[PDB]
Nucleic acid binder design. Structure first.
Ligand SMILES: [Mg+2]
Ligand SMILES: [Mg+2]
Ligand SMILES: [Mg+2]
Ligand SMILES: [Mg+2]
Ligand SMILES: [Mg+2]
Ligand SMILES: [Mg+2]
Ligand SMILES: [Mg+2]
Ligand SMILES: [Mg+2]
Ligand SMILES: [Mg+2]
Ligand SMILES: [Mg+2]
Ligand SMILES: [Mg+2]
Ligand SMILES: [Mg+2]
Ligand SMILES: [Mg+2]
Ligand SMILES: [Mg+2]
Ligand SMILES: [Mg+2]
Ligand SMILES: [Mg+2]
Ligand SMILES: [Mg+2]
Ligand SMILES: [Mg+2]
Ligand SMILES: [Mg+2]
Ligand SMILES: [Mg+2]
Ligand SMILES: [Mg+2]
Ligand SMILES: [Mg+2]
Ligand SMILES: [Mg+2]
Ligand SMILES: [Zn+2]
Lengths: 83, 81, 52, 66, 146, 239, 90, 101
RNA sequence: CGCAGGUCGCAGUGGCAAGGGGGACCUGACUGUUUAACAAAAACAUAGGUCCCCGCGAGCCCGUAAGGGUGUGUACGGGGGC
RNA sequence: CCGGUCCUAAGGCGGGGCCUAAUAGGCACCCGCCGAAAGGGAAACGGGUUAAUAUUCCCGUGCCGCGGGGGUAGGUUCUGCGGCAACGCAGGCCCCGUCCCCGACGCCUCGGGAUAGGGCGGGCGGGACUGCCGUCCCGCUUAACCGUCGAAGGCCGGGGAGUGCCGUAAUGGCGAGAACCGGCCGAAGGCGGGAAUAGCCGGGGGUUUCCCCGGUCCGCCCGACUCCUGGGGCCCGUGAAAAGG
């Protein structure tokens, strides 16, 4: 745990306590947000900051939800209706 | 599984102030086995067990008794004090 | 530099640890066998006739 | 610990508390419902606090001053 | 025991600031627990010396003098103090937000705004006062800009 | 001790090997692609000599091919005998018309592609000899060979041409390239060593060596190895 | 307005007969106004706070939320004290 | 005009994306009223932006401002009822960033 | 950041901190590397030039063998000299 | 709830097989496993206490995983509701499959937002000094966790622009949809709750560390090498994987 704090994997956060001491808290970085399977851009509705796995994220109310953006879904539906 | 009691200055202070008995057990005893042994032998209730292995290779357990049983009374009854 | 200054770097690493079979400080952790009794590479005990 | 602003919402937790702690100030009163999971705090006008405190006692909820 | 080690923990100060009265030399040998030290602190036989804060009286006097223009001559500068790149950022924002406001209020037509915008970017104007004078001299607005 | 550098390379020490874990996978034809696919990505692969295209077939099979010059993400390509000879399409060689520039040419069907894979290279389809299932192609070196007419090639030229025309201006630039490749960088001349370390090492005025025969044993077979000739006269006789 | 998302959810929950959710959304509306207005006052952004307090007074009337009025009065009292100190210092 | 009363459409955005519906009314140049009967396809009756529906080559004969059962009787007249229950399936694996720039 | 004025010292980047400069020849282009413990160089490397072996079941190399490295590579490439 | 333990990396070991006079020698193949106390990765903070341990003991306030009980929404042939939309909202229960994404990534440079820390003026309390002046110094703190707010950026609806029009630190942008108007998603961190009852400072009384009393404030400034965000550039160099979610 000391060399583990010499690496920059964790955030170094300096905080003052109610006891008057200034300490360093080593905190996790945010996980990356879900990305569109086509464009790789963050998906709307799910790009909130999350700091651990195992947290349920609600996908937008749309077919294919948090898998592709609305732009990809609409275009793909337009292609299928014709075809 | 119990080898002896610890009756040092620290151990006696934890008996009076925190209702804990301190024992030396076999090094392979687990917290589950330690709690069962103390309850069976002495008819008390164990709240929790903290364990450590001393630098001389012996396993020491700080055994906190539940809130109806006295660690000081048990040591007196056993005649180890 | 090869003498006293370089000896300073022998303070933290290791090639061998204690062998569970023979008990000597001869178990090569990288090679995963004992340099004395051969444990980990040889189920027979290593001992050569050129050794007294 | 959690903060609740509406009295009607707070009373659902206040009625189930192991103890309600009262901290008095000049302009408002903190009522803290200590439940097994959370400490629920509400700030109320002092007149409202007396009425709320009376109801909790009538429901045999323990009330202590801190 | 080392009483200063215990006293420093209790007083929450450095060992370098713990003072033990010489009148309590007889009682130092009897100290066993931190509570024994707490007895001596309560009796005033052990206390903490106040920490030193470097005095700023000389600095505050000098700070006022420097605000009036003193002690910042050629012989007192050893390196670069003016950030030229930061100065450009301020100069652009000062000029652009003035010109962009005049256009938003209708006081400047977009054609005249573009010429001045490019002239500001081209380092034509020394400062906002120079820009105002140019606008007033060349009647680029219906009414003079203050 | 005395084994020379070319002899130590064959032992496969770490400094002589290819760091192929830096790449996404081999750039080869799968054995059973057919139909239409889509170019879904075009990627730089460390240590390779050309950009790589990721192609997704209709049945979901993905494979890597070297990107034809002009290929674009989202392009629809066709694989098989029915495919028109358009750039990026993968065709059996017996179906490719003569005079067509192709790349990633299989020598036998299913070997994945062997010839004309470096950036800017291409092979020319010279002739067809279908009574024995062979296609005649010219390779980038100018050599003319016969290949299995059932083997696959891609239409066009390999993208990324012109890379070697720009100089590696600094030693450091080639150093970074070498780290993505297998090359040992840098190299020491043989005559800069002592005799124990090279046949050319040694004398007060160090010299190169005269050519060795083709039968020379390893450790002797350095310098010119059974060369037909050397110098400008050899180039002139080559022509 | 800042806390309009909560106003809509209250109407939506009430129109669906969800009394428990309507109460929870009512709580969230007050949290949105009070927490944001309190932060503005603490940072002495009195103008931003006053627009929140004005809107807070309207939705308190709209939904009959007594606790909103009590907390708005507290924050207004703190605002005037800040303004008093500024004018005297000026 | 394509988006007219009786033209069958498939909504492309929103919660109801991929579901068939029928234009029953025209509001303005941006909005038409679609109600592909909720009990049939799952699209409730409300206005919709013309950019959020894709027209289908199928069209039915109904009157302006038609109601839900009038639409229902017309769909069975054209025999498209089971058509109005199928939901369009996108093929997401054939989409590349070029199509949605 | 600037201007006007007054004024003291031998000395005002006053301590601290802090380039001597110029002309020419030989030599290696340059940055880099080296004889751990007497050699730091004009030696090695280098980018660039050029030649050779090679169309891949290749060329060159390792292994008694099974097999292996170059090679998840393919002449705008791999290897070998100067 | 701090690390190991789990995962895979470069790589390694064992069984099978193939090779070997033979092995304890070799390994391309099949199967499995090992391989990081600086990579990935569940969950704890503050105060107090000891002669010696302290995110481990004690007090307070929480979190994670797994399992269960009650209530509720919801369900009980069949489907949750709202919004043009971006998307919002308690969004039924169990099992199985497939796909996608997160995990998951360089260097250089420049705009923006914070916090740690530092300072200035006033106030209250306490301390330093004595030749003259009356200045100088110290305290005035606020954890995790719950809620709410959200800059850049992206997106949705309206709009329909070339006498152009809108810009930046810089590059600039627009019928391949600008200005402008309204909205949606959305950091560090702020603020309330935690929480003054703690800690600190000052003044008293006890006894063996306990009790009481007063203060814990007002208004500004600088501000990171710490934390967040976005823009631009470079590469014959392209900056891991898997568990897990
Ligand atoms: Mg780690
Ligand atoms: Mg990380
Ligand atoms: Mg332990
Ligand atoms: Mg040596
Ligand atoms: Mg080693
Ligand atoms: Mg000076
Ligand atoms: Mg410059
Ligand atoms: Mg290498
Ligand atoms: Mg030599
Ligand atoms: Mg020789
Ligand atoms: Mg010879
Ligand atoms: Mg020679
Ligand atoms: Mg000096
Ligand atoms: Mg040199
Ligand atoms: Mg030497
Ligand atoms: Mg030397
Ligand atoms: Mg040389
Ligand atoms: Mg030359
Ligand atoms: Mg020669
Ligand atoms: Mg492991
Ligand atoms: Mg210690
Ligand atoms: Mg002050
Ligand atoms: Mg700039
Ligand atoms: Zn051994």
């Amino acid at each position: 745990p000391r060399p583990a704090y010499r690496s920059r994997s964790l955030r170094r956060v300096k905080v003052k306590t109610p006891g008057g001491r200034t300490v360093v808290h080593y905190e996790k970085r945010a996980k990356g947000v879900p990305k569109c399977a086509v464009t790789g851009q963050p998906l709307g509705g799910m790009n909130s900051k999350v700091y651990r796995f195992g947290i349920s994220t609600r996908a937008p109310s749309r077919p294919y939800g948090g898998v592709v953006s609305h732009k990809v879904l609409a275009r793909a539906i337009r292609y299928a209706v014709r075809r | 599984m119990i080898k002896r009691f610890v009756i040092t200055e620290k151990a006696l202070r934890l008996a009076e102030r925190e209702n804990k008995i301190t024992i030396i057990v076999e090094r392979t005893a687990t917290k589950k086995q330690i709690a069962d042994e103390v309850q069976r032998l002495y008819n008390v209730k164990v709240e929790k067990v903290n364990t450590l292995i001393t630098p001389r290779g012996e396993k020491k357990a700080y055994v906190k008794l539940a809130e109806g049983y006295s660690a000081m009374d048990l040591l007196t009854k056993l005649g180890v004090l | 530099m090869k003498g006293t200054p370089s000896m300073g770097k022998h303070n933290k690493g290791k090639t061998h640890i204690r062998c569970p079979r023979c008990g000597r400080h001869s178990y090569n952790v990288t090679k995963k066998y004992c340099a004395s009794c051969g444990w980990g590479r040889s189920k027979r005990w290593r001992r050569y006739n050129w050794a007294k | 610990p959690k903060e609740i602003f509406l009295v009607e919402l707070w009373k659902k937790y206040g009625e189930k508390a192991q103890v309600v702690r009262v901290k008095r100030y000049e302009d408002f009163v903190k009522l803290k419902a200590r439940l097994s999971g959370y400490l629920y705090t509400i700030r109320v006008p002092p007149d409202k606090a007396e009425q709320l405190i009376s109801e909790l006692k009538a429901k045999n909820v323990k009330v202590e001053e801190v | 025991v080392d009483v200063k080690r215990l006293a420093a923990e209790i007083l929450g100060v450095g060992v370098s600031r713990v003072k033990i009265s010489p009148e309590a030399v007889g009682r130092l040998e009897e100290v066993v627990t931190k509570d024994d030290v707490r007895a001596l602190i309560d009796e005033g036989l052990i206390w903490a010396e106040p920490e030193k804060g470097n005095s700023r009286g000389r600095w505050r006097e000098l700070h006022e003098k420097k605000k009036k223009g003193r002690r910042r001559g050629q012989g007192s500068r050893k390196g670069r103090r003016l950030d030229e790149e930061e100065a450009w950022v301020n100069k652009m924002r000062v000029m652009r937000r003035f010109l962009n406001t005049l256009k938003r209020q209708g006081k400047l037509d977009p054609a005249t705004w573009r010429q001045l915008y490019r002239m500001v970017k081209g380092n034509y104007f020394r400062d906002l006062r120079h820009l105002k004078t140019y606008i007033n001299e060349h009647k680029l607005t219906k009414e003079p800009v203050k | 001790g005395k084994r020379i550098l070319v002899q130590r390379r064959g032992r496969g020490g770490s400094q002589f090997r290819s760091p192929s874990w830096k790449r996404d996978g081999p750039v080869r034809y799968p054995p059973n692609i057919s139909g239409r696919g889509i170019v879904v990505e075009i990627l730089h692969e460390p240590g390779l000599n050309a950009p790589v295209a990721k192609i997704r077939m209709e049945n979901g099979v993905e494979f890597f091919n070297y990107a034809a010059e002009g290929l674009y993400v989202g392009q629809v390509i066709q694989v098989g005998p029915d495919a028109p000879p358009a750039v990026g399409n993968v065709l059996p060689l017996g179906k490719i018309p003569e005079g067509t520039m192709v790349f990633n040419v299989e020598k036998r069907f299913g070997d994945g592609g062997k010839f004309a894979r470096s950036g800017g290279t291409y092979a020319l389809v010279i002739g067809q000899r279908p009574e024995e299932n062979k296609t005649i192609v010219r390779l980038p070196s100018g050599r003319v060979i016969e290949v299995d007419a059932r083997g696959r090639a891609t239409i066009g030229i390999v993208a990324g041409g012109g890379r070697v025309e720009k100089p590696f201006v600094k030693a450091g630039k080639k150093y970074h390239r070498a780290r993505a490749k297998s090359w040992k960088y840098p190299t020491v001349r043989g005559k800069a060593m002592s005799p124990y370390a090279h046949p050319h090492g040694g004398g007060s005025h160090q010299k190169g060596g005269t050519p060795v025969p083709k039968t020379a044993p390893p450790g002797q077979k350095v310098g010119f190895i059974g060369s037909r000739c050397t110098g400008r006269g050899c180039v002139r006789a080559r022509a | 307005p800042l806390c309009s998302k909560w106003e809509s959810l209250i109407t939506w929950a009430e129109k669906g007969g969800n009394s428990y959710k309507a109460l929870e959304f009512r709580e969230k509306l007050v949290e949105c106004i009070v927490y944001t207005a309190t932060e503005k006052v603490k940072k002495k952004k009195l103008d931003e706070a006053e627009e929140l307090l004005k809107y807070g007074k309207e939705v308190a009337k709209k939904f009959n939320i007594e606790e909103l009025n009590f907390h708005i009065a507290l924050l207004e009292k703190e605002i005037s004290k800040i303004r008093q100190r500024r004018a005297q210092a000026q | 005009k394509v988006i007219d009363v009786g033209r069958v459409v498939v909504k492309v955005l929103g919660r109801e994306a991929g579901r068939k519906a029928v234009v029953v009314d025209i509001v303005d140049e941006n909005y038409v009223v679609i109600t592909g009967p909720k009990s049939l396809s799952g699209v409730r009756r409300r206005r919709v932006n013309i950019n959020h529906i894709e027209p289908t080559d199928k069209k039915i004969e109904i009157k302006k401002g038609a109601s839900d059962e009038e639409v229902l009787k017309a769909l069975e007249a054209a025999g498209l009822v089971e058509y109005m229950k199928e939901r369009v399936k996108p093929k997401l694996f054939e989409i590349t960033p070029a199509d949605v720039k």
